[PDB]
Symmetry: C3
Subunit: 298 residues, 3 copies
């Protein structure tokens, strides 16, 4: 919801109350988790050439009872934007590994999650300097790329998207922090068909694919699969764990789209993982789980 | 302040900074409680028939100091409205007992309080799935009902309102969670003349009644009274306390009304409870306490 | 961004994402500190005479990791406004000392800092009942006075600011909670030149001086300094810490405003404190540091 436009300065104030109640035999997941979101994108044209933007967004829960306050800044960054030189912006932002990893997180509820926020660059984090450049300096249309730097431990990364034509995105991203990661994804986008898959290796090799159709009265079914395997492991100081599977599941989900402002969705995580000494001490869940929600957004 | 309305999606954002310096002999109350609430109501017409909504207004303190943070989500939900088919909304929402109980929470400062928030659905809560139906299916003018449902522990209730005509309002509900508390009460609202009473017993009984008149220049005086009395009693694990009053007091008060957007108001709790083996440990305030401040809103 | 004006009720929503990267040899300093702030000014015209305003603005960190939350209400007060009798505003407000003390705090990033927040009335805090009078009952131009009163511990204070024609401003102020504190400052304000020096003494003496010049192509380059020397202090229940310096350093800085919504800045704090018995047992910093951020506001 754009709340202000005047003399080349525009502020969309966006956000939503998403209602949703997880079902499970798991008890760290059964319950109400209606959270909600606020955040604004800001903008200011300085000269025909640049723009000084700014962008924030925080989450805050609703399931937490009174007195208690489960809050946190999702993204919060300021930058600048020059004519066909692209843009730099430093703040709490997305790791530039997300650029490709993104295409697979699209599920109604249970997406990404083979990478985490503050998980050494693959997702969000703090202190990120970010130069991404769009339509390769105005000479190559449909080719984008970003070269990124991190705040503390110290890190770096790069990403290149490419819309090869049609809707076939192709994408790569490399990153390192002091632990590196590659990142390859290919998305199809066109005629209501969304087919995107992505995988990589780390310092430990994970995959994810997802396929949706967009029904016309407004309903986006989704079959999606993702996994992650590894190598040797270490409980804090010691404990030698062999090579097992981290998180692997098939997923059917459907979102219904009333209009922009209001969606409604059921999603069925069909879990695979087997209950063992791994998935006890680490406390990785093994139960297939299912969630319904009524989101209102603005 | 409805900040945006266009293409049948509105979004009133509302709030207030309400300053009040309590006064007391007690040190738990005596001091600055300058607090504030932001939030928004959001709408979206989907059809001739339905509109989706969503609403969130969470609290913050101006009394806590710098670094330390006292906030919590008062409400957060999203639901649908079908025309004459009532309205569903699940989430951090009000309780069904409150429908009826509310008519008594009209004091300048200290009203209701025979129930806290999260106090088993008599007020706010979490997981509160709800369907309310106004004007009874659009066949009876002014007889409205609710049947609600809670998250966990488990539960349910349901209210029936009726503006008998003129300015009267008879009111009733029951509720239950796994503790079952009922509700009876009346209100009268015609000629700046506000009269209202409510009470029920639980599983153990409490009552509240109030009277107000709205002055033409803008001064709504309120004398009001409420009390609670109890049966068998247990201090966490154990105890034998007998039957005593958990809270009973008479109230003078008078809100002044510059306009809608601004208010001043003096309220004087005239407590009756005597200092005893009850009000020492369980820590019930046994002091009469008097509040002074300025509510600015938008 | 004034977001509302209708029937003489205004509402100016502001905020800003100022992503800075602190450099130092410290480990509590060097790193990322993207903070951000929201805040609303409030307005409602009641008569020709009064217009009952209200303000608010809490902070929120963007460096704090996910799940964690670093917030605090900076100001949140409600007040009325009588034209030629002044303005009363009770709430989480600035202390009556800051009227003067302020003129020195204009440095790009670090400044003031001699007084803390909640630092016994010298700046921000809670419970402030405030009556300031502008243009002195409308009969003396170039003058303002204030006599404030705190909540709890108890206290009072006064202030007298006078822009003495041209661009010279004389500032005097006093506060006395039950330890006192005077305050004396001088600002010069005209042709692209700021010159502001101030000091005081508490129950313990401090001083701050700054001179910034406002360029024509944008860029206010700054030079500034401040020092605070005390008497006998004691660690909680003991320790005789002779006579030393809390903090003394010369500062250099430079904001570069692109326009009124975007700024870039560097701030080179040159610190002069030697590390000894004091700085080690009290967490006082011995290092000189560099600050580099990118404010965006609205």
């Amino acid at each position: 919801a754009e709340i202000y436009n005047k003399d080349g300065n525009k502020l969309d104030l966006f956000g939503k109350v998403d209602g949703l109640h997880y079902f499970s035999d798991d008890k760290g997941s059964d319950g109400d988790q209606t959270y909600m979101r606020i955040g604004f994108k800001g903008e200011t044209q300085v000269n025909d050439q640049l723009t000084g933007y700014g962008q924030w967004e925080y989450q805050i829960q609703g399931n937490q009872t009174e007195g208690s306050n489960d809050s946190w800044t999702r993204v919060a960054f300021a930058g600048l934007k020059f004519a066909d030189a692209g843009s730099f912006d430093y703040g709490r932002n997305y790791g530039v590994t997300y650029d490709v990893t993104s295409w697979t997180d699209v599920l109604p509820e249970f997406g990404g999650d083979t990478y985490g926020a503050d998980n050494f660059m693959q997702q969000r984090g703090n202190g990120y300097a970010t130069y991404r450049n769009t339509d390769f300096f105005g000479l190559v249309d449909g080719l984008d790329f970003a070269l990124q730097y991190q705040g503390k431990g110290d890190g770096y990364g790069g990403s290149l998207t490419y819309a090869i034509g049609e809707g076939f995105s192709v994408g790569g991203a490399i990153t390192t922090s002091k632990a590196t990661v590659y990142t390859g994804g290919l998305k199809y986008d066109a005629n209501n068909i969304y087919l995107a898959a992505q995988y990589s290796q780390t310092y430990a090799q994970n995959f994810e694919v997802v396929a949706q159709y967009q029904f016309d009265f407004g309903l986006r079914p989704s079959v999606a699969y993702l996994q992650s395997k590894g190598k040797d492991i270490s409980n804090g100081y010691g404990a030698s764990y062999g090579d097992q599977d981290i998180v692997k599941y098939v997923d059917v989900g459907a979102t219904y789209y009333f209009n922009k402002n209001m969606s409604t969705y059921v999603d069925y995580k069909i879990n695979l993982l087997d209950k063992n000494d791994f998935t006890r001490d680490a406390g990785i869940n093994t139960d297939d789980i299912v969630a319904l929600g009524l989101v209102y957004q603005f």
